[PDB]
Design a protein around this ligand. Structure first.
Ligand SMILES: O=P([O-])(O)O
Lengths: 115, 96, 95
RNA sequence: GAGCAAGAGCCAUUGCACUCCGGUUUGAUGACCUC
């Protein structure tokens, strides 16, 4: 984990996930997300902070940085699992299309660019 | 045991999803005359069974006679007439 | 000449392919394992199919039993597929 | 292992409907499926 993220910023990003499933396209789970990034389809990825073992998502920051993809941390992976609409935990996700919620996502990106 | 426009079928394969079940039933049974509807549920009380609503009783009879014990999804159909008229049939009669 | 695969024609052409595959399965699973089911995609070749079982006996029982069965209200013509005509069909888009 | 990306087991029920009603374990830390 590279930087700290305030709670409200997360909660916002999760709301934005659940919403963006309605108009955009989401890739859920770490293998799909890594693939999405490698193919440069990733608009922004989500990483959970309670992944055990950490080696599962540990390569996402480096890989996003190499492909110029913004990325945000969220506390719980059960939360992330709920946010993407599945019946199990989720460790990492990625928005690869949004349409409706462009400016919202946009605004979140610079907030992440803070640190 | 008294002839009805509707045949009641059971001993069906409970693993088959509902829409598929309706369409497969309609294949094997549209054979016998016009079908007004096919009714399927997978609730506790209604699983494994189906109702096929023929427009004509003759159709019903030939279906029942011709398909009795037929291995549908590898599992022998038990067919018998429905105990009472399906609502659409009653409406047609017209009682209801 | 007996095969583990039967060829069917006089199928009903106003039936979409997924439903067709499933219904075919519904009526043929009773004779044994089915490796695959292919329906025609061309227009030549408009109402045709291959059902590929695993065992030749399966295909033989199926052929005897279902000859002329009025599937979607049209009695099937069923025969043994010629050797490799199914994989050759799948390799092209004839299907 | 590669590909795919959300279902897959078990227990119970043989049950006559036309608005709808069992339980349980597992699966994005990757199920059925393809090679
Ligand atoms: O959608 P899939 O996982 O059944 O291929």
């Amino acid at each position: 984990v590279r930087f700290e993220v305030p709670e409200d910023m997360q909660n916002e990003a999760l709301s934005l996930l659940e919403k963006v499933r309605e108009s955009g396209k989401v890739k859920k789970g770490t293998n799909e997300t890594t693939k999405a990034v490698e193919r440069g389809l990733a608009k922004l990825v989500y990483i959970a902070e309670d992944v055990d073992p950490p080696e599962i998502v540990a390569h996402l920051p480096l890989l996003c940085e190499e492909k110029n993809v913004p990325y945000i941390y969220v506390k719980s992976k059960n939360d992330l699992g709920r946010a993407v609409g599945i019946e199990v935990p989720c460790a990492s996700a990625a928005i690869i299309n949004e349409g409706e919620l462009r400016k919202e996502l946009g605004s979140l990106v610079e907030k992440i660019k803070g640190l | 045991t008294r002839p009805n426009h509707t045949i009641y079928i059971n001993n069906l394969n409970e693993k088959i999803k509902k829409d598929e079940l309706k369409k497969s039933l309609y294949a094997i049974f549209s054979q016998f005359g016009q079908i007004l509807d096919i009714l399927v549920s997978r609730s506790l009380k209604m699983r494994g069974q189906a109702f096929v609503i023929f427009k004509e009783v003759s159709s019903a009879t030939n279906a029942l006679r011709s398909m009795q014990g037929f291995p549908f999804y590898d599992k022998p159909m038990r067919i018998q007439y429905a105990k009472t008229d399906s609502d659409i049939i009653a409406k047609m009669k017209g009682t209801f």
